[PDB]
Design a protein around this nucleic acid. Sequence first.
DNA 1: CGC
Length: 601
Amino acid sequence: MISYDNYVTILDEETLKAWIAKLEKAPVFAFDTETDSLDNISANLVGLSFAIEPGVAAYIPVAHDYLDAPDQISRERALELLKPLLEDEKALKVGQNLKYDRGILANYGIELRGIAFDTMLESYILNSVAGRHDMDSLAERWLKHKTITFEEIAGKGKNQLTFNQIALEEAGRYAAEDADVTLQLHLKMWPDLQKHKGPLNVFENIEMPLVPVLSRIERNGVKIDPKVLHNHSEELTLRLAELEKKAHEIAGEEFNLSSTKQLQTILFEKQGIKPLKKTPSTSEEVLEELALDYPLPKVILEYRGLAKLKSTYTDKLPLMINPKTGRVHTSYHQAVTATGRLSSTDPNLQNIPVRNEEGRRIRQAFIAPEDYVIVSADYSQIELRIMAHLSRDKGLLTAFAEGKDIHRATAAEVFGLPLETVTSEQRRSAKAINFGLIYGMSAFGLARQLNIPRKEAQKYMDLYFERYPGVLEYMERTRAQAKEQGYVETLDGRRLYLPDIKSSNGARRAAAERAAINAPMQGTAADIIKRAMIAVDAWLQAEQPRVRMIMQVHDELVFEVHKDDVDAVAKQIHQLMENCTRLDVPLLVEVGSGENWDQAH
DNA sequence: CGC
Ligand SMILES: [Eu+2]
């Protein structure tokens, strides 16, 4: 258990000043903030907690306001006394997801510096797939300690209390323990993080520096036109009605556009071959085969897609606009993917269809405020260039070197013919091979994407490996070190542990082998993208130009740049992205601009 | 992930 005896509750300036003096001389100290909401931009600071040493932590309530709440130091007085310490780059801080804490302080004109250790990121760099990297999971994993849960003090359901409604002492037990546990977690993980220069490098120079830039991107938000979004919605309703009619008109009667129920009773009952097509799916889509000649399955295909899109983005996005800023603030996750790439939610910017006309209309709703323009900076096929570097292949390297289209260059070599004459079907075959290799695609999966028979796909792969020998070496060498040491690394030293590499189970092990080939390339892209963000944000912070970094999705960074400064700024972003990251992989940055995200894209 |  945890009583009111463990940690102290600071209710007076004199005691707060005694603690600030102790904090000033501590080598590092843990700190956490408590608020009345998860929404960073509109949340109010309810209190703060600190920990100077294991077992020694305190809670400073500043805004609890339930009926008859005891006097507390005022939020303004507490912050002005704490400000010097918080803004001191030399006073080192530890915390669980400091991104959140940095933002809250920003709501009060305070610039959190000394953002040295994030236990969430410590855990993530040590072993990204060890489990969840939230504090409750961390405490139980590294300390066999079960923390007080937020529900334990606030409750559940709609009648859950906000932090300011909880009693001083209850709040104190919770907040002070977090600070305490965080420091203990750091003390256990920080030493471990040094047994290897790779992970240590990524944590120190990539992850940690990225904490404040992610906070700034999240707090900046993105401008979204709800009118455009609504037009699109109304139109889609009309297109869904029409499409349904087109389906009915083709056969007879009414029905759901649900397979293995209403479709099979129609489609194969009027000629075709029995099996269905799962919405397993990105390998066998029976419905889009028939689509090249058959009309019905083609309309059902396009119907489902528009249905998904409308409810996921057209109807959701407008509801995500924040009343305080009038912008949408997406949640970026730094410690979630196995490979190290950032992920996104509310909205999940990465699920907006790219090569689909409708997804483009979603992107047009992402606009620039008056006098500004949206600028998109993207790393052209970064993972493909990374694979070229990793395989040391002179052919692939030279293709990128002389500005030729790698897919046409690849097909020119694989099919043995002039570059100017390679056909679209040949370029399409080479493209499938090139991207298949990055995911470690089996010679049969390639056959299912290209629609060619098995062994005809194999015929192509053998010709590829013979023309580009260095790629097979990489594949073999990577599957080798994966078994020998249970993990693979990126160019910067980031690791992906593969427990199922010697699984003794068939497919469970196959998966581990696919991850072995893929992760080094995907993780390296992520490391590169993270370094560009840090580099770009540094310039932004020092030079103060008229530009905001507003998004990060796939291999691109999106900004809002003033119309009168677009040229000078584009020159600068470009140089930062293709020169101040890794000097080994041959990188190319495509910069564009427009009135909205789709125009610059 | 964070209250
Ligand atoms: Eu907390």
